[model samples]
Target chain A: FRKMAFPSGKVEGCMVQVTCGTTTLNGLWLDDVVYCPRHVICTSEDMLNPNYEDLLIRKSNHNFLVQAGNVQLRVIGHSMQNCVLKLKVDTANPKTPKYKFVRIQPGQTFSVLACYNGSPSGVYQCAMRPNFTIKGSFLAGSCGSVGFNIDYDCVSFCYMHHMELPTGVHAGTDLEGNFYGPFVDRQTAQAAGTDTTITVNVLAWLYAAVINGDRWFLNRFTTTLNDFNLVAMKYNYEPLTQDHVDILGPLSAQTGIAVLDMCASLKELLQNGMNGRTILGSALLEDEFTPFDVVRQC
Target chain B: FRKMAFPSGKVEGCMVQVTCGTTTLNGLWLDDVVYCPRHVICTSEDMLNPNYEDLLIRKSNHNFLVQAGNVQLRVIGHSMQNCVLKLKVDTANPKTPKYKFVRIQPGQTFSVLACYNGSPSGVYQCAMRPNFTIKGSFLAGSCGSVGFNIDYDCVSFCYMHHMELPTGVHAGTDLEGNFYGPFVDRQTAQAAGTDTTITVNVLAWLYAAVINGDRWFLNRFTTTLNDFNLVAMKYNYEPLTQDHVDILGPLSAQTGIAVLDMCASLKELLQNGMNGRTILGSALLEDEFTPFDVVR
Candidate 1:
């Protein structure tokens, strides 16, 4: 634990967006490479070489992605329609495109892309990778630095894309399953008349086992896991039971296959819980304040 | 980078408090180990071994620390001095306690301690460690589970104790310098009518060197750091100058020693900036929106 981890390379990268009007979110494939072609936004022959004048063909949908792996890329914002793409005709330049590419306005939140030379940096250097936050509206006629060209920046990477804490609060955990306090510069106290409530979300598998087993399930129960013991015990968050494994663990181990499938299926519960209204779980009906996705395992 | 970091051990640990009437805030040392002795609150013989009858000694000040390192401990609050300590007399059981130990109310915000057997358990397994948040008012006669006994939990670790982001937003960075986007589970967008602004605080050494060199300085300037380029160019955060080093880098290299000292000295600027009033820096004067500890 004392050993420090640092990045092997410097922060480097740029982003590219693929814009097409053919109901396809793909870009142009030119000279054996694909670049997010433009109709008007970044149609400048200077910034983008005159090569952009060449009639484009739709070949790669993810033409903007570089070094993307199985789960490498991240989608920020929702994809939006209304973007229009066309070619700057320098005469006789007419070729039907046949490829696809990623778009900025995809029905998500934001967009992040990177060049090949990125490494890592910061305390969680392993999580800090170089990438460009393709900032802009990507409107059909929009111009300027907004969507015409994407900008690069550093982002704290997360391996497990879990539902985040309420809006602003972020959970910065480390290798040991330890969640860090949010206040950084120094310890911040509960204000004179304010308070913050943090509820621990248990493992989904535990919920599946408990509910499937029909063992004292409730709308909400404040229980805590005594992680100190060998296999750990679950109490009301009670009893200080014997130093042995709780019933949930064995159940978890015995039917993990079914439990996992249920876990996958249970993901549906998150949608209903986030309304911030009375959460009504479809799988396990619950009427709690709201149950946003907690720890993925939990 | 693909290799995951998981805690070697399950999360475990507990907290302890030291209270002494002699303004020492130390606790009783017992059986070669130290414990934060109690008075009326946990005075019952049932929970605490009738060891309370053994009178107490103020033998150790940091008696509660275990597996604590040269820099292992983390302070969560500003220590308060309202709590009081005393001893329950079982008739003639009066032994003057000596020595020193750490106290719960010793002018620190919060207390965290650990048991001997502890391991890590999170994504950044190397950064997660087990410890306890000794919750309590530590009042002379206060009782209950709050302070009478501490609880254990796991905590994310950070090598560089830097200023944190605004309250509620915990910067969950990993091993790489690339600060991670904290929206867990999924990508969260700025809500309608709401926005989030993040600013990068340049290295203090760079500031010192630039200032000492009389390079242009300002109260506030919106710029970006192009980390993509080698040695990273400095502009509006610019110049995109010749793909070469800027004057700041060389200057940063030449006087990092003095710059570091100034960086250390510059820490004083943080205190004045937090008033939420116009932040006026003594070392580097400025009048702008308040800047609390951003990332510590």
Candidate 2:
């Protein structure tokens, strides 16, 4: 189950649930704390923050694949008041069950909240801007820093919200007007020994563009994506045509929108693709190995 | 005999003379308009401008091998007075030693004081900003549009000047800390059928970077140059080792300087290399192709 909230902004939360045979997903807007099904096995958070809080909310849930998997989250905060956020993890693998706790505080104007899970049973990690990373297992949390009174209402300045990437007319397309290099699935990627690294890099670049609001980086991103698409078409699945090259310039000339919405959309595409599903039209379809799709279900 | 001027500015003028055999180059700072020898054939100007002008000046000379070449200049001026800057090009192959004139006005902010060379004798062109390509043999100029008795000193607001690319520490270098891709001479290029297109494009990109002060473009330029060097080394000659790839990142990290100085230096290298010359340490030697130089 996944829950997200933004007292003063456009915060978006995406939740994914993977079963032994089937998977379910949901996206939500938080008026307050939201919840998912108890059958949920995994949940992830991409908390986009624009401000800090005196009483920031933090919580934990259950189920992590015993294999090499990760739970990653990033936060951004600012405060002059000393505040502590406690993070804990618990595991019950008889021989390797472990317990851990991490306490982080804002010492100056802007503080980075970090939590890490490095247990043999499972590992959980979270990050915050500038560069804070914390790792652990089934986690629990709260807040404080010696002699600090708890603010039940949790007052915070500048609500943090994650904006959606540009869509509709703003989503990127190639000269052929096809959804560009819908990435090849994991099966093909694994066979080729190139597991979605290009796709991952593009998503990271898009995120950087959105966070920095950098037009140059966005331009670079488009060109980079376009180049990779060309490469994929030529060598990935089946040989594809090289018709889209010349028409891109003219198409690009007609659109000058920023990268915000597109950034969010690409992020969703990556998340879904990595999870073995892809957006085709309005539906998420089980991806095939040859034709490129944004992700492969893990 | 191309004479250029810039009022209240650090005046710079570079003159290079190439004959059938020898070449003499001069870089000078002029206090006023300077003259040249009548025997002087090819003349080019790179005027680094800082300000404007009142007392404008002009002059000329001869000798174009006739197959290919260029004579370029830039100027900025203030108006309200008469300004006559003479430009002449002589060639016996033409029908007449004709002449023409163009009258211009300061339309808005900085109007183009364009003078076209419509002469019967094979003509030439000069410029002063937003695309000033003049045409003709013997030409002279000035301005006027209405009944407002203009002082018409041809007092143009801006005396445009071409700035030199940044030099010294800004010059580009490769891994091994040596100058990279030194271009081969013209004779070799002709035999190889490779013109100065790459050299010209790099110069233009460098100019764009300087004009916009765009670090992104400079970074792009370096990578593009590096890629081309890799390609040229592998295909133009023989299969080559890809050692420079790793070294570039650290080299790039250390120097974020644009390719201005290197662009200008590359242009000179191209001109010399195209005309059968290459720089060996401190000396210019007649090149024998194969191994690529830093600016090649």
Candidate 3:
């Protein structure tokens, strides 16, 4: 074989787990003010009293979208058990909805809250105006420098909360529309890699449209392996026929949904495909490889 | 200062760099057929075959704003110099004049032919296209990878080149038009403790018309300092003020010849602002930090 001259570097990959922990999420509400529009965001504090504490709930200055699963919240030290935490999804701008309060016991933790899915793709952040009340409390806990504390030793000016990723439009489809990528299950990922063959049923339409216009290559097919590190990738391409284009776009358009859901649902039926394994040929997933997360709300 | 209680472990940041290396930073190219108009990419050899190459070269594919810098070719074994190098920019989609060609001496080591801003504020990428063809070989007696072969090997695709932090108009800014947070030096960041500050002025202008309308804050500002991290970020906001709405929409209307010139000039000054210890302080110099490349 001729001396192979690769241009860049060794093709390497890693897994990135987008974990949406409950502790990192929260919802916003208003104080005396009644129902407001969805888009209205409150940027300023309502009252300023250096001597006394007045809990003035300002505006939810920003609107957001978060995609999430149904999360259950249990009120600490109270009778609240498996309370349904519904994140009021505001469709309008600025401010919206009736805010739902998290019931927490004196010593227990308010372990349940629902995050709104502002959009279906990524996450969104909503800002809350601080309440300068004499109560000497804060948003997370009793207030302090660490874990969970709401205290008056410091002025609570504002807070930001991360929404969740959008999902659940067509039963099984995700933002990527791929059937096997979303499951956190390691077994499913392994099974999918071993048994899942590239069908291109959904991709066929995209390529067909691409051919008619004269461009062929689309975005690269990326996958995370193992729990982290060592993502394996190989570039492959083939020309599309006019017939493939003719049937794909129109068919998807007519259905008015992404083909990803159909793909995932199909994989589920094939038990042989994606058996909840995150590793491909003994590989960890991307999230597992390079573990990093954005502070949706710190 | 009163101790304020706040959430912990939340991190805010901007785009992430996928590849790193010594590369030629090219200007943005408008491709004829593609959704993402601005992408850092290259071409492949399979794409250069005439039958397949034409398909790859879409018309106006590489409508880049800047010119390509020159590169010296390196050859070995024979006398010394006297070989032409076929240097091409991997403007993924062909049809346009994206790549270029240059020549070099036979026995000389590979050297830089041209240089560009290659700043964080700008988009840079190395060429790796299927059209890559080497006419002459580096002589075994004199040339090697450093002298001829070059460091980058994956030539089929182009990865976007990223600059160091606190760079580009893509970075953020403060109310006084001053850059805050993004500490170019080590000491200032260390002094910041857990609070990470990004250079705001650098990212203030996404474009002349569309300023990024998101809010950035110092979350867990104190507790995080022990880890030694630099926090820079970009965000999106909805239901913004009328001023923000105005800036984001009809952005094309405000981007005139003069504005482009101003931005180009500013970018130049900013590039200089990133050079030395004295200059890093200039980034925080408030009003005194005007780009020397621009007129007062």
Candidate 4:
């Protein structure tokens, strides 16, 4: 249960945004209990009475206001001097748009864990109107980036941070003669500079970058290998070794490079690395991120 | 079947990554058939001779090599005197993953349509190992981001362009006393500067930006009406009226801004606007994006 209180007083115009799974419901405390428009009456009592007190007791016993797929809620001390909220989040409630209620007094707390059931999560948004007035636009105040993890038998909502790579890095080979990527992350690029003879997993890192269009290197494939070597050499100022030319020489002669070629090449390289191909001998196919790379080839 | 040809002569080390639904199968033309190590063999002949001619009729009759869940394919041209290839793609073939062979004597062009189903698509990658040597590294010499649109109940690869928006703009009110956005997009911002008091759909524009962590305006919710006006006025430089203060006065006194509050407020505002609340008269509960519009 989480402790919460309005800025004293009747606090009529205040709003609460309740999110369950991907669903969002906004509520206002009217008359006595909180009513979520288009969602449900998130109170313990029915609106039959202008005021309902016994309903609060019955609702509090259950300790949840709305029981919707994987989550439940309880509101304590709604009309009391102060109020505390308790949430019993579980799984997606198959049946909802109905009312459930929970009652609590001030200084009370209840907690229940909910699981993320492989369903779309909600982008939460909470807002308020202090003492109610007109023309004051509803402003977006607080929202959380919620993520999920599968740990043992538990699946829970965890905080997810949005990560982005630096923009300047593009598709190109580094000084180490290793192709960092057509879609290389900054950290990987920096790491590549120090290590020339390391095996990296292009699959694990390349997936996200390619889908989002952060870096596109396959376009460089259409040109001849010698042409690519020219550009790479120009940037790094390192003369191409005979070994590098031999590996890329023939493919460069092909015309009209397509997306399929890119996918197939990566797959073959990954498969070859998995099959225990020698490191430098393969030109640069094997890496640490192979499908199943034993720490020490156990 | 769609036919294509490489730069000619034992295109030995070239690779073709066939994708169907979420599955990706990479193949190399080792012999007569296109052989995918883990996936099904893409060929028509039963692997007997150096040159399989009858396999072409058998393969072309079926039109494709591997038939997975959502798509199928065939290689009609390989080991010819400079071959022109054909690809026959179809929907789901829950049957076999054998080699379907095709014969093309260098000048035949066959065309076929490959559909992009609504199901999860594949990220295609093609590469070649210029030298027919194994382990020489398959360089990423070529890749394509092929898009597709529905035509005649068919899906074929098409070109798609990447789009972006200008960076500088954030959330603020426009000159005409109408609050444009906490952060508007390139298209919406341009649309906002023109008409002064128009009831634009800020709801649609607000969702993406808020989720992306672009513009935040809930901080303005805590201060008094004058303070928010001072900032909005500083940027846009349009003087605020008493009328504006009256509308913003109540909502401008709350503290603790969160993304959730922003989400809920917009949702409530959207609901109210859908219910038909006048822009200015409603106590700050509505106006499509107002925090203090009203509960009436």
Candidate 5:
């Protein structure tokens, strides 16, 4: 059971926003329980009347700093004159997954991770501590060129972010004279100095979005065939039809999603819910966001 | 059994494009079966060599045009040298669903529909017959401000379209009045002189798209509560608290999706495939694009 009281009677059940020094936070108080995103310490009026106690009791439970299992009724950095809070986890137990603490101040912000596989994952830091009154949309944050911002005004909404591509690697040929669109991302597309390539931003905020790049290259299937026919004739493959051109092949070992597959996957995530794991494994196909490290130091 | 042959040896087996007068069209000669978007007639060298006859024969065989059910191998406006073709459906039997004929001529474009309902459903007409050399995107057409265009180059493609809303109905309030987002499409929203509104364009063409408009109004669902409290007290509603504002209600009957739901539906259709039926009922939710009328 979780217990809460206003010992100093300054704030009642976290009704008003609390401020200690330069730090101020939004606290939600419901059913006699207090909640603060930044781990704010608040006092209660009477310890007996509103014993804001969280429900947790077991063996080997010493005076630890909050039970790790009760992630919901998170209690830390709060105390009074003579009140008791059973806020501690059993460290002796080997099965407990793990525990990490994070406390953000007023002016301070932290990086929110978008991908987590290897080195150099895409990340954007928070701008502020959720500050808005009666208004329109706000820029939540930004990543390199892309910004993750939306509205708070209406029930329905959408958005689109455009990406650019290199014309050469995008659809370039060499002195030897051959056509292709073989490039990884835009950077690699540009490295060829001539050829490179491109939701999408979505509901355009929550789920699906349109990513307008070079529209022609993605739709025209002839590029595949034209490039195919030239290379095929030069290097005797199967049916070489100068009369009626038809059929296709991969030509080379390729991986990753095609543009249509990316589009298809975008639809899947929206219909289904995104739980951080990738529906399609690519940069456009997002992965899980995990805080690699937590700290108590500034 | 579909059969196709090049009688004039000139345009061998539809290898080259076919043009009679000003009407030229694209034809796909696949496996002895001829396919044309707009009806095109071609000559065959011999009636026996490649019999371009679509497989269908039954009673009431007076031979009409093409079988309506065989939407795939559409046949009409094509014939040659004593070649007897049975392309008609048995329409005398009432069990046979009715048929409609449509023959699009070259240079003459037709409307490609986006919506279907009561009065004004959105539509965009095609520009020309499919003609492109080596390169980029084409403007298939436009619906007012929106364009239904994409690429022909890569396997993957996407796009976005922006929508505008008037301040009044979108998120507007009078000097002595209340606030709301009570307007339909942009036209009505414009009429609110005032309060008006908001995929999103998709795959950004095939499936889902991010329709960039006003963002703030959606994510922050406070408008619902704020509009709820004042209207509640003025109308004798439930419990009220001065210390802390809590609880909310829908002041009136409302229908359709919130922005997030539209986003969610976009995800659904992409994950699932869009066969023209709306995952959500709103205009953004989309519906089946059935040809309401077919012309002969």
Candidate 6:
């Protein structure tokens, strides 16, 4: 339940504008506007006296402060992980946009959040865990870049703060590679990168074996075999090692057509999305954001 | 079943790059270059070869075309409709990228589509639909102007085009006291511009009733009431003609504000996967690319 009143008989237009602000302009509408003292209005009741007591005014001057209403939305974080936001709103008040969230990030004050102007409203709760995965999109790019600014109501703020990679180890390398992208510090990355390297190697071995054995890859078997024989002879060519020369050699222009063909074939397969993920990992495929810490004064 | 053979004496290490002449390419593995009388490759053992068999090899080159292993991706339509594209891909061969369809509008076409490159190895189909609800953040602002181009094999085309409001009905009001936004022709619009007379009698009647009923437009009970007045009534102070002042004008503005708030609220709702079609409409929301004939 929520209640509103104009204690003073100051039901003027200018004051109302000052108090309501732009949020009211978006679509928060009032069923009726009252212009009198004791202008108490609730979602359940209409103005009682039109003349002596119950009066309604669409345009009011009183600074209509909030009464009380339940926060219709709730966010649950996974496990014991605490999400720093909780939202409350007045479903009864159309003149007021819905409440989105309250930020409880480290070292921040909690306050009411309003609808972001001219944008669709969304309510979401993010969970950061033992293996913290902050899901978003490519639009936010990597959290490693700009602080992921979650928007709700009329405000936007960073959702997380600094999280360091293990000490003396380069972070930014994970099984998905997408979880932790490229680390800025190569020196520290070497140790941290080990975990993903093993996962990738295992996945790669499995993927390669499957490609060699699966019907999908087998159906194209004749073609694969034909190409493999021509290139996998006395001089074996590892297509993965080659980035420039389709097959991985410095062919000034003299390499045999077959070698050239092998190079081209490797390029084709690698470029295909089929085997691309193993090669690209999170460095390229993305689904989360990075975090940052800013200096604040005491 | 597909087969290829290199001449027995041919040198090893030969590579092959197969393409559909579109955006996709397929690489073939060869057993040392060997001799082959005739090699066959088809979607299946029971597959019937194209009739051009006699001419399969104009001279000695057997056509190695593929069947059931191609795909496409695209966006399809117009005027604030939900954007979704069609996806079609051959699945027999896992090497094929997924295919998608897009309904291009009359004024637009599939804007962005790309693949890993190479002929798809199998028939695969899938659609790529981005989040339609705008996130009230800088990303929305950044993504609005930048359109991405999608690359796919040839033979890719939108399913259909969308019809749209023709040129004569273009939005925007005109001079000579005429209301704009809809019309079959220019002459009809010009003929309806003569009414400048104000209905003062009706206004006077409503005002009298308002006074007797002790009704007050000044709403001091809410902050929004005052805020709306200050923001909306900035220009002309006096309440003039019916068109000059009325609830519709303010009500319309309020509706617009509601839309803005909806954006913020909906963005919050979509994490659980809100169906934009419920709000935007299927005809307009379903396809990404609607062609000109259908749209215009």
Native contacts kept (model 6): 0.00
lDDT of 1 by residue, A1-298 (tens): 1111111011111111333332212222222332222332222333333223232333233332322112123222112112223222222212222212222211112111111121111112111111111111111221111111111212222111101232212222221112223311112231121121111122332343343343322332222333321122221111123221232344346544333332232233333332332211122232111111111112
lDDT comparison, 3 vs 5, better candidate: 5
**lDDT for position A234 in model 3:** 19
Supply the global lDDT for candidate 4: 0.25
Docking class of 6: incorrect
Candidate 6, which segments miss by more than 4 Å at Cα?
A: A1-83, A92-298, B1-296
lDDT of 6 by residue, A70-114 (tens): 222121110111211111222333433222223332212211111
Candidates sorted by TM-score, best first? 1, 4, 6, 3, 5, 2
lDDT of 2 by residue, A32-126 (tens): 11112111221232222212231122222322121112433221221122111111223222222121122322110111111111111111111
DockQ of each model vs. true complex: 0.02, 0.01, 0.02, 0.02, 0.01, 0.01
Position A134, candidate 6: lDDT = 27
Which parts of model 2 have CA positions greater than 4 angstroms off? Answer: A1-234, A237-298, B1-296
Write candidate 3's Cα lDDT for A1-298 as tens digits. Answer: 0011111100000000111222122222222121111111211231121111111122122222232233222211111011111223333213222223222111111111111121111111111101101111122211101011112112121112211112101011111111212322111212111111122332432222332231222222322222111111111112223333343444345443333432233223232433433221111111100000111000
Among the numbered candidates, top TM-score falls to: 1
Relative to the true structure, candidate 2 has a C-alpha RMSD (angstroms) of: 27.7
The candidate scoring highest on lDDT is 4
| Winner by lDDT between candidate 6 and candidate 1 | 1
Whichever of 1 and 4 has more TM-score, that candidate is 1
lDDT tens per residue, model 4, A1-298: 0011111111111123444334444332322343332112123124223122343334442332443234344443332211112232332223222222232211111111111221111111111111110111112211111212222212222211111123211122111112222322122332112112111123222222233232333333333435434543433322333443333323333323332334343434433433443322222332222211111111
TM-score of 3: 0.17
Clashes of each: 102, 63, 112, 88, 95, 130
- Model 4 lDDT, residue B117, Cα: 20
B227 Cα displacement, candidate 5 (Å):
13
- For model 5, report DockQ: 0.01
Error of 1 at B228 (Å): 34
Tens-digit lDDT string for candidate 3 (B1-296): 01111110010001111111221232222222111111122233322222322322342323322232232112111110111111123333232322212222111112111112311111111111111111111111111111111122211111111112221111111111122233221112112222211112221232311222211111112212211112111111111223432333333244322323323333343334323322221222122111110110
* Candidate 1 vs 4: which has more lDDT: 4
